[model samples]
Target: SASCGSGNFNKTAAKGVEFSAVAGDCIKYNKSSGTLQIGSWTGVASSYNITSGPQGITNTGNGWTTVANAANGDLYIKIVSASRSFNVKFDNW
Candidate 1:
């Protein structure tokens, strides 16, 4: 059986930060399959590998999003430009 969890986050800005629950795992995100609730920024983004993957979140509804992973890779949120800093969380099973 698979478990479930949930969480939210907010911050000023930063280059990127790994998901708390998925700091060390193999994770993959389904594009437009989930949702997002981010505000007050432009070019806000998420990814499995910042070095290789970069997805942007412009629209608040169903924007670029990903939670935690069980055996998948890691999840990361990267906010670009201006006063760089961040605090974010994602639930995993």
Candidate 2:
């Protein structure tokens, strides 16, 4: 089935806390075809790229791609722009 989720990424402000990337609006994650298809976000930009992600990442476009499988540890996708960054973290397989 096609599923969707929305949330905001928040962090605690501390002395050593340093970050630039902000969270995008709840986007789409397709799971009907037995694979996770990552869709676009609300605040789509022209300079967004998925820098770090799972093992099988295809169609490396602006936040629109696919995740075939994942590695052992946490399945976190890291995206970056010219000045900031974005990330998607999955807890389960």
Candidate 3:
């Protein structure tokens, strides 16, 4: 079947986190095609742990890291430790 019309797409990052659309740390997509791409940091400090849930996306602990694949429609983020940093990216398709 052929698809028609444009759909709404969304992406988000938790507070205290830094994100960008250049490469790693941002969500890029084609509004017309509903295509999405994800980018993030890897091998973050052990002190921090990245986690995604039905509410949003966040990092748990104190460290520099990146969390990718923060999907829309029922997602959340949180920090495990007192505070931390993270990033995320997404697309429509």
Candidate 4:
């Protein structure tokens, strides 16, 4: 069955962080999928950017409109900018 998970994160400008799925958890995906919907903290500007690492993922679109999807296996989220607090939600299908 598909489910969701979330986490809070804080990063400085021009920095980046990586996220890994648990041993028994993996992000589910389908052929007609694109875009990752994440939750942000209060007052956090949409300027914050995100990208996935080499682990079968891709980020597309622009600020507040960006979408990320997995190409294979589980996916990870990487912060591209900094000085902000936000929570990311995994949109499993």
Candidate 5:
């Protein structure tokens, strides 16, 4: 039964004035999976590519890529879309 009952993706991001990050800034993501976890900066980037991953490779496609399986360890990403740049981060493996 692939339906939305009481189950959730458990995907939560820090939302606050203090937690706000600017272009080329790195944010902390304690989740195990990097699937759709990288936050879009400003007005959405053209593409979000993973420059490096401590565990393995990650999503490297434009307009959100579905990363196969879970990605652990340090995850570094570079986003250069909409004329803005960002250094994505995924922590806590």
Candidate 6:
């Protein structure tokens, strides 16, 4: 069930907008395990919204490390977004 191997691999990603699965959605990376991060698009960096699911998200320091229960398709495990300043760009590997 492993599409992409583990380890560190960098790539490009657009901003995490609403009405779509940017980072948190029904997939591997989002379902996989790792310390997620959100970099900035411009000089200033913004924070993510965390629309629903995964309770304890403070929108400070680092980002959403892990969800409540990532595996097994947890309804509470979805949506980790950012703003224009903080464009979420990454690979699902």
Best by TM-score: 5
lDDT score, candidate 6: 0.31
On a 0 to 100 scale, what is the lDDT of residue 11 in model 3?
38
Model 6 spans with C-alpha error above 4 angstroms: 1-31, 54-87, 90-93
For each candidate, how many residue pairs have backbone atoms clashing (under 3 Å)? 7, 0, 12, 5, 0, 0
Which tens-of-lDDT digit does each residue in 1-93 have in candidate 3? 121112222235433344532212222222223322323454232121223322223332243333334334432222222223434333334
Relative to the unseen true structure, what is the C-alpha lDDT of residue 43 in candidate 4, on a scale of 0 to 100? 34
lDDT of 1 by residue, 20-86 (tens): 2222222332223233223222332323332134443322222324432222343334333222222
- lDDT of all predictions: 0.29, 0.32, 0.30, 0.32, 0.35, 0.31
Q: What is the TM-score of each candidate against the true structure?
A: 0.23, 0.29, 0.23, 0.32, 0.34, 0.29
Off by over 4 Å in 2: 1-33, 41-64, 71-73, 82-93
The Cα RMSD in angstroms, rounded to one decimal, for candidate 3 relative to the true structure is: 11.8
User: Candidate 4 or 6, higher lDDT?
Assistant: 4
Q: What lDDT tens digits, residue by residue, belong to model 2 across residues 1-93?
A: 111112322332221222333433222222223444444333433132222334323333245444555333322333323223433322222
lDDT, model 5, position 65: 32
lDDT of 6 by residue, 10-52 (tens): 2223324312223333222342343343332333323333223
Q: Please list the Cα RMSD from the true structure of every candidate, rounded to 1 decimal place.
A: 11.8, 12.4, 11.8, 11.6, 12.9, 10.4
Stretches off by above 4 angstroms in model 5 are 1-30, 33-36, 52-66, 85-93
Worst window of 10 by summed lDDT in candidate 3: 1-10
After TM-score superposition, the amount by which residue 92's alpha carbon in candidate 6 deviates from its true location, in angstroms, is: 8.2
By descending TM-score, how would the candidates be arranged? 5, 4, 6, 2, 1, 3
